[PDB]
Design a protein around this ligand. Structure first.
Ligand SMILES: Nc1ncnc2c1ncn2[C@@H]1O[C@H](COP(=O)(O)OP(=O)(O)O)[C@@H](O)[C@H]1O
Ligand SMILES: [Mg+2]
Ligand SMILES: [Mg+2]
Ligand code: NA
Ligand SMILES: [W+6]
Ligand SMILES: [W+6]
Ligand SMILES: [W+6]
Ligand SMILES: [W+6]
Ligand SMILES: [W+6]
Ligand SMILES: [W+6]
Ligand SMILES: [W+6]
Ligand SMILES: [W+6]
Ligand SMILES: [W+6]
Ligand SMILES: [W+6]
Ligand SMILES: [W+6]
Ligand SMILES: [W+6]
Ligand SMILES: [W+6]
Length: 296
């Protein structure tokens, strides 16, 4: 931190005690959030922010640099060929992907399958010139469980059928049981704390995203508010930590970059329809849910 303009030893200590330890977080901060640190003037805040942006080279980009930026996005396989294709390769890092659907359509299964897949190195697709092997090494997942449906047994079974070690998935997946929207939001805000403690968080799951909010603000206005702050935190986390963020929506409006509607097909079959994305056509993906997890 002292490399930053105006920042000396004591200011660097204050910054780290407020949780601002990397340049990117400072470069993307508002003067307000830094001045609210006290001991940190408004002029010093504007100076270190400008210095941070410069060290992170955050200005206008054009031509080939536009392609380079896009190449920093890596993708996580879903174990379904069809679903991966419709996704343009797999679940994207630096974006929030939402799976909505009726009860039993497979939302929680996909969340569990993703936690397992993260532990199979060959299921993370990336361009080696834009994403280094070290960036996706020892990846870990965070599962914020709002329903009480996380099942370690299911993790073990899906891992076994994929030929990877179940205990290893459990060891590298943090689960937070949230009973209301305050806990759900605080847990999401605390993921930055796990990352600074050395955990390479690369997958964040929120199952469910809207249940607590609907149960508490059954007030679309405020609800939408609190939910908007929650969504901004998820989108920022995805961008800044080059992380895949997945959320489920139990349906019977907000900022997701990819949105699916999953429905039941015959017995085993499920259909996932991508209905919103910034660059892909609407398309349907047929898959199945079996003891092996998600397949086809
Ligand atoms: N061990 C398993 N073997 C085969 N199918 C399973 C297994 N566990 C769960 N499923 C399937 O997943 C369905 C439930 O999916 P789930 O993810 O919980 O739905 P949602 O979260 O959308 O309400 C089940 O009813 C069952 O068909
Ligand atoms: Mg993004
Ligand atoms: Mg569920
Ligand atoms: Na300095
Ligand atoms: W609603
Ligand atoms: W409602
Ligand atoms: W209603
Ligand atoms: W209504
Ligand atoms: W409503
Ligand atoms: W309505
Ligand atoms: W509804
Ligand atoms: W309704
Ligand atoms: W409703
Ligand atoms: W309605
Ligand atoms: W509605
Ligand atoms: W609609
Ligand atoms: W609409």
């Amino acid at each position: 931190l002292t490399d930053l303009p105006g920042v000396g030893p004591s200011t660097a200590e204050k910054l780290v005690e407020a949780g601002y330890i990397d340049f990117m977080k400072i470069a993307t901060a508002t003067v307000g959030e830094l001045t609210d640190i006290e001991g940190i003037s408004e002029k010093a805040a504007a100076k270190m922010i400008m210095g941070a942006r410069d060290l992170c080279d955050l200005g206008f980009k054009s031509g080939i640099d536009l392609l380079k930026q896009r190449s920093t996005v890596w993708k996580l396989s879903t174990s379904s060929s069809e679903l991966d294709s419709v996704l343009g390769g797999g679940l994207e890092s630096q974006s929030v992907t939402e799976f909505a659907g009726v009860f039993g359509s497979g939302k929680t299964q996909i969340m569990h399958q993703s936690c397992v897949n993260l532990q199979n190195p060959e299921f993370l697709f990336y361009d080696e010139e834009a994403v280094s092997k070290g960036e996706v090494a020892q990846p870990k997942a965070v599962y914020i469980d709002t329903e009480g449906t996380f099942r370690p047994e299911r993790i073990m079974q899906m891992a076994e059928h994929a030929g990877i070690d179940g205990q290893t998935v459990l060891d590298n997946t943090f689960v937070a049981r949230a009973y209301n929207s305050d806990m759900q939001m605080l847990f999401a805000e605390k993921i930055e704390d796990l990352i600074q403690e050395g955990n390479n968080i690369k997958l964040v799951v929120i199952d469910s995203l809207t249940s607590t909010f609907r149960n508490e603000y059954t007030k679309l206005a405020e609800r939408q508010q609190k939910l908007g702050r929650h969504m901004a935190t998820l989108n920022k986390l995805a961008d800044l930590f080059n992380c895949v963020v997945l959320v489920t929506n139990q349906v019977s409006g907000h900022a997701a970059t990819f949105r699916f509607f999953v429905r039941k097909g015959k017995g085993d079959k499920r259909v996932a329809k991508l209905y919103d994305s910034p660059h892909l056509p609407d398309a349907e993906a047929i898959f199945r849910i079996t003891e092996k997890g998600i397949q086809d």
